[PDB]
């Protein structure tokens, strides 16, 4: 009626713009014929569903409707303001301009499109002997449509919609708007197919029923609306036919603020967004992206009279996504810069943590666990690690925590952790109530998350018992055991293990004997193959030279020089598993020799006897590992020949792990 709900004029009109839409639709120049022709048949070809659109090309054809007239009102200035009218009406012209066949449907291919022709086979035959309802254009689509906005070099044309923004930068006037913001993903609760229109079937009168559903809910129809059952005493029964009704894949995510955008006060703002179509599964939780999409509110249900006023509360929809930080063939050559350089075991050893000065010998062993291997298979079976567990003992911090910052970063499956920090419940699959979608789904991590990869660790003395026993079992490795609740499972943890821990308070006392200084259990240290004692005595010469490096930065961003060229991880990492494919086989020559030095070590460590320097007893596990060491060391040489120097090279690192306690 007039008055209430008044009809209101706006200077903007798409009536001829829809024609101007089809002027732009199909026909086009810049990219034989226009890009929109065979590409729209490309969807008619059914090798594509998602329809991708950008604001970039609209400007040129708008320039093409411009320069180059006749002059026409701009679409794009009417887009970012609404653009939801463009997600349909601009798109609704596609049935008019789309080719009929355009090729063979075959059989499969797929279902649906074989049924949808049957639905239209049933729909057209309804009117065949009938002599007039038809399937709405929205009822049969089968293809998604997307928009990617212009930043851009077009904005400096000069020409806005693409300017990255904070959640804090989100105005209320941006509702309805196709917009773009940078943000960190969060949640990313699982996607599920959602129907636009139920298909009920009358049975008795048959036909087909299509009722639209919007947002979260709908009110389902009943009885029979079919006209054959209309005005007849008998109304047919109907319920939803899921094979018939169309579905849409629906994902969603919260988007956190980058935290540099944030004000000094307040709080990071999570932003709810909902993923749909081919755009689904395009994101993971915690990833940083410039998000581009239209922003619309989805009230209400309710409540209702509760809200009031309405106070929309809205949400954002995802139009498009731009993510931040997205053989043994020819990459062997990318290995070959340092292959021709040689010194794989050193230059790469020097390649480790170029940021921290000295302790390259410590870094020297770092290269081994970063590689490790190679395990064994006894066929019993019992598999043996296979993995290096390294500990670092010294205080104060020395910036030891920094070594883990570099190592895990480079390392695949790199996981940095600390005593508290992740608990043993954090290293196990632990039941927790899932917000929104329910319920009580288990989420594991840490050890379970770090399996088949290195785990860096700090506050290792403060991990207490609950962690110690777990990692005590994590030293049994290849397992994580939970008898808790109804959960009886034991899950494989392939985790590589390294934790640096601080000596007994306040710092280590040279008078203090070994193992009295350490805060860790002996059985906990016995399954350790290596520990590097970090005790720091001031050396005026060394203090300057290191201070000099501490002078050298902040002075500049580039540390390494006079002289060296640390390998970048990507090219460096590629040699890792490339070397890990080797699996060196032991030569018996070095084989028995390692046995020889063992009974020597089984002798000398025991002849140390009571207290003092220690540690005994030189158990076979270390030899079991020391053998694996040359097996890990051989991998850097590859060649799987296991040299004796390659063997003895580890034995050199064995005594060095200790004996610095004299310093």
């Amino acid at each position: 009626m007039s008055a209430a709900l008044p009809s209101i004029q706006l200077p903007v009109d798409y009536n001829n713009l829809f024609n101007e839409i089809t002027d732009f639709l199909v026909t086009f120049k810049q990219d034989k014929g226009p890009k929109y022709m065979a590409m729209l048949q490309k969807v008619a070809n059914r090798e594509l569903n998602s329809v991708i659109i950008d604001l970039d090309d609209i400007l040129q054809y708008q320039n093409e409707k411009f320069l180059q007239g006749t002059q026409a009102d701009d679409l794009v200035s009417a887009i970012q303001q609404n653009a939801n009218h463009f997600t349909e009406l601009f798109c609704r012209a596609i049935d008019n301009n789309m080719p009929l066949p355009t090729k063979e449907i075959d059989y499969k291919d797929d279902v649906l499109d074989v049924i949808l022709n049957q639905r239209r086979l049933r729909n057209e035959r309804m009117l065949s002997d009938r002599t007039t309802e038809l399937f709405p254009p929205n009822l049969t689509r089968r293809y998604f449509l997307y928009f990617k906005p212009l930043s851009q070099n077009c904005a400096r044309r000069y020409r806005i919609s693409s300017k990255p923004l904070s959640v804090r930068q989100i105005k209320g006037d941006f509702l309805g708007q196709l917009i773009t913001v940078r943000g960190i993903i969060t949640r990313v609760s699982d996607v599920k197919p959602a129907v636009e229109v139920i298909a009920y079937t009358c049975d008795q009168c048959g036909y087909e029923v299509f009722q639209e559903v919007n947002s979260r809910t709908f009110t389902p129809l009943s009885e029979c609306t079919s006209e054959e059952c209309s005005q007849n005493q008998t109304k047919g029964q109907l319920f939803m036919s899921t094979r018939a009704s169309k579905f849409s894949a629906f994902q969603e995510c919260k988007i956190q603020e980058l935290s540099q955008q944030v004000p000094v006060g307040h709080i990071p703002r999570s932003l709810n967004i909902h993923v749909n179509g081919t755009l689904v599964r395009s994101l993971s939780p915690g990833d940083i992206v410039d998000v581009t999409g239209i922003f619309l509110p989805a009230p209400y249900t309710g409540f209702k009279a509760l809200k009031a006023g309405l106070l929309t509360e809205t949400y954002l929809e995802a139009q498009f996504v731009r993510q931040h930080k997205k053989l043994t063939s020819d990459v062997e050559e990318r290995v070959m810069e340092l292959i021709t350089s040689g010194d794989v075991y050193n230059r790469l050893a020097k390649s480790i943590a170029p940021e921290i000065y000295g302790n390259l010998d410590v870094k020297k062993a770092l290269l081994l666990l970063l590689v490790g291997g190679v395990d064994k298979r006894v066929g019993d079976g019992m598999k043996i690690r296979g993995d290096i567990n390294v500990c670092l003992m010294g205080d104060p911090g020395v910036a030891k925590s920094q070594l883990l910052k570099a190592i895990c970063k480079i390392s695949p499956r790199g996981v940095y952790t600390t005593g508290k920090g992740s608990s043993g419940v954090g290293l196990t699959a632990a039941v927790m109530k899932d917000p929104v979608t329910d319920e009580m789904i288990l989420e594991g991590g840490a050890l379970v998350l770090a399996d088949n990869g290195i785990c860096c660790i700090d506050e290792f003395d403060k991990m207490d018992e609950s962690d110690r026993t777990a990692i005590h079992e994590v030293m049994e490795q290849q397992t994580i055991s939970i008898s808790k609740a109804g959960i009886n499972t034991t899950l494989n943890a392939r985790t590589s293990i390294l934790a640096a821990a601080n000596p007994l308070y306040g710092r280590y006392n040279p008078r203090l004997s070994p193992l009295d200084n350490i805060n860790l259990p002996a059985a906990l240290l016995s399954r350790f193959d290596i520990l590097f004692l970090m005790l720091d005595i001031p050396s005026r010469d060394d203090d300057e030279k290191l201070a000099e490096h501490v002078t050298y930065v902040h002075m500049h961003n580039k540390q390494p020089d006079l002289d060296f060229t640390p390998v970048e991880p990507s090219k460096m990492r590629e040699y890792i598993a490339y070397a890990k494919t080797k699996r060196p086989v032991m030569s018996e020559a070095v084989n028995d020799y390692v046995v020889q030095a063992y009974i020597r070590l089984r002798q000398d460590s025991k002849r140390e006897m009571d207290s003092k320097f220690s540690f005994g007893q030189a158990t076979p596990r270390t030899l079991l590992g020391i053998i694996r060491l040359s097996q890990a060391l051989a991998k850097l040489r590859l060649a799987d020949m296991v040299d004796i120097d390659d063997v003895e090279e580890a034995l050199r690192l064995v005594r060095v792990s200790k004996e610095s306690l004299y310093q």
Binding site: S7, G172, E313, P396, G506, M555
Partner: protein, 591 residues
């Protein structure tokens, strides 16, 4: 409409025509609004008005706005927007007015309010707490009827609408408007306002003797939204809204939820600030002197004897220490943190009160403390509309500000582990239920602790005397032990100033420092390095035979310390001359 409305509008012609100063100010808005239109192919419509002119204009219209603003205001609303049309009508919308005042009656704090003060625009001030977070709110709606076309249109009015009461009209939402065509929701042509609501507690400073403070709510809409963080000191001014039923709405005790709406809510420092020329020139004049800093030191202890070396460290902390963040790498900690320690009656906590005033950000802490301190502690459940909302604790709320800690030694170590995350990492990490985030807390911090046992803080070794092992020691850049040792020569000095107690300017200092903060960072100069390299190394070469701990982190402070004095000198560049200052206080740090 009554001419009473049309006349009041008509009554607003000559004003603000006189004083006409606002006339072009809105035009100043018009231009800048046009300015942005020039570059892109930001200013709020609402304008400030000193109420005072009404006293030279209409005293009846004056107090009436104080009386029934609900009436006088809406016509004043039109003429502004109306003249706004006439001001620029060429090119092809609340336009609110603030009124700093020109107060007041109507001057009251939230603790003392109404019933008479209700339904009247009034200044009320205090803490911003707890400041409900913002949500979007629509007013206008629009639609398209296919296939007949045209365009639909719809309007909305809530309870908090405008100012005065109006008939409530929840519409559901416009659809299938006759003829019965499907109506698709249309946006951005339709109107929106993000909504905000916050309470405000009355000041504990002005709080009465034995009673608790009562925070009272106010709505925040459009620009009014997010103008301020929670916990801020600000004076809100607007009419007090009594809307909502007394239980009579449904036939079947307490009643009438109420709050003030609008208007100005001027932020208040008790930062900001104005500077001008004459003032900053004093800074420019004082900056030349290298003799100023000790004056900067002496001004710190109006009631306090000496410890000027302890004082010097304080201002150097005010500087911020020149944060430099690695490119695609982790930042080293910029700001300095310290802890006062020593025998009882040190006046260390007393000093924090000095740290507590001119500092301007931030909150202090006495022992416990928690749960969580700056932890949000997961404000929950929901609150509101089922929405989980974290509310940052002090440690987060204090970001880019000072942290003072009393009884730091008594505090539970549970949150101490977080203070490692609080200090070394210098950022907040949160997973509880819950929201999963890591948010920056870079806040500058200081604490205080007693000797572990008795008066032996002198005799017994400083280790075991720390009372809070271990890495806690590494964290603080300076720890000063306060000896309670007494001297008759000392006490003689101690008396008269304590005597004069009962019977260079300070405020100029914080203005001198605040501007000294953004201008200008000294960066780094190798010349300062040349002496200090032999210094710190030699420090590890000697002190380790004397005391500890000694770490490169202590050396890292040297860059912080010298960084600060370079600010104290207002030097565009670092100088080795500053190091001797830092090293000396570091000499005093050891001795």
């Amino acid at each position: 409409p009554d001419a009473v409305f049309g006349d009041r509008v008509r009554r607003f012609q000559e004003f603000l025509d006189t004083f006409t100063s606002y006339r072009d100010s809105v035009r100043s808005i018009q231009v800048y609004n046009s300015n942005n239109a020039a570059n892109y192919n930001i200013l709020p419509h609402r304008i400030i008005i000193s109420l005072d002119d009404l006293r030279e204009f209409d005293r009846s219209f004056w107090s009436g706005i104080l009386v029934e603003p609900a009436y006088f205001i809406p016509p004043a609303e039109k003429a502004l927007t109306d003249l706004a049309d006439s001001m620029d009508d060429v090119p092809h919308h609340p336009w609110k007015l603030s009124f700093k005042g020109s107060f007041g009656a109507h001057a009251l704090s939230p603790r003392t309010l109404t019933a008479q003060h209700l339904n009247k625009l009034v200044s009320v001030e205090g803490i911003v707490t707890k400041t409900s977070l913002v949500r979007p709110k629509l007013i206008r709606s629009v639609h398209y009827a296919a296939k007949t076309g045209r365009f639909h249109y719809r309007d909305y009015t809530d309870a908090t609408t405008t100012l005065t009461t109006r008939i409530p009209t929840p519409a559901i939402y416009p659809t299938e408007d006759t003829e019965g065509n499907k109506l698709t929701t249309e946006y951005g042509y339709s109107t929106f306002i993000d909504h905000q609501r916050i309470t405000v507690q009355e000041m504990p400073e002005m709080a009465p003797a034995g009673q608790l403070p009562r925070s009272i709510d106010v709505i925040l809409d459009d620009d009014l939204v997010d103008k301020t963080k929670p916990g801020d000191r600000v004076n809100v001014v607007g009419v007090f809204k009594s809307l909502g039923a007394g239980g009579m709405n449904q036939s079947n005790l307490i009643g009438f939820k109420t709050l003030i709406l609008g208007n100005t809510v001027y932020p208040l420092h008790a930062a900001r600030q104005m500077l001008t020329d004459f003032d900053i020139r004093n800074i420019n004049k004082l900056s030349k002197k290298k003799d100023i800093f000790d004056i900067l030191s002496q001004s710190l202890a109006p009631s306090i004897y000496g410890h000027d070396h302890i004082k010097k460290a304080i201002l150097l902390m005010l500087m911020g220490g020149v944060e430099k963040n690695l490119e695609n790498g982790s930042h080293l900690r910029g700001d300095i943190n310290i802890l006062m320690v020593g025998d009882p009656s040190t006046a260390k906590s007393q000093l924090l009160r000095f740290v507590l005033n001119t500092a301007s950000l931030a909150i202090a802490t006495t022992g416990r403390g928690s749960s969580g301190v700056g932890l949000t502690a997961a404000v929950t459940t929901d609150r509101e509309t089922g929405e989980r909302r974290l509310e940052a604790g002090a440690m987060v709320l204090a970001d880019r500000g000072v942290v003072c800690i009393d009884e730091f030694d008594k505090m539970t170590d549970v949150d101490r582990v977080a203070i490692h995350e609080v200090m070394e990492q210098q950022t907040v990490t949160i997973a509880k239920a819950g929201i999963h985030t890591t948010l920056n807390a870079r806040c500058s911090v200081i604490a205080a602790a007693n000797p572990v046992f008795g008066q032996y803080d002198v005799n017994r070794d400083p280790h075991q005397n720390i009372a809070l092992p271990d890495s806690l020691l590494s964290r603080f850049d300076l720890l000063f032990v306060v000896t309670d040792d007494i001297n008759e020569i000392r006490d003689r000095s101690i008396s008269e100033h304590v005597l004069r107690t009962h019977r260079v300017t300070i405020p100029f200092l914080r203005k001198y420092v605040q501007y000294a903060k953004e201008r200008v960072i000294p960066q780094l100069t190798q010349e300062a390095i040349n002496v200090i390299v032999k210094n710190y190394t030699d420090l590890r070469n000697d002190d380790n035979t004397k005391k500890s701990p000694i770490t490169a982190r202590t050396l890292e402070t040297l860059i912080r310390l010298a960084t600060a004095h370079a600010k104290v000198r207002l030097s565009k560049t670092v100088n080795k001359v500053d190091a001797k200052v830092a090293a000396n206080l570091l000499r005093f740090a050891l001795l």
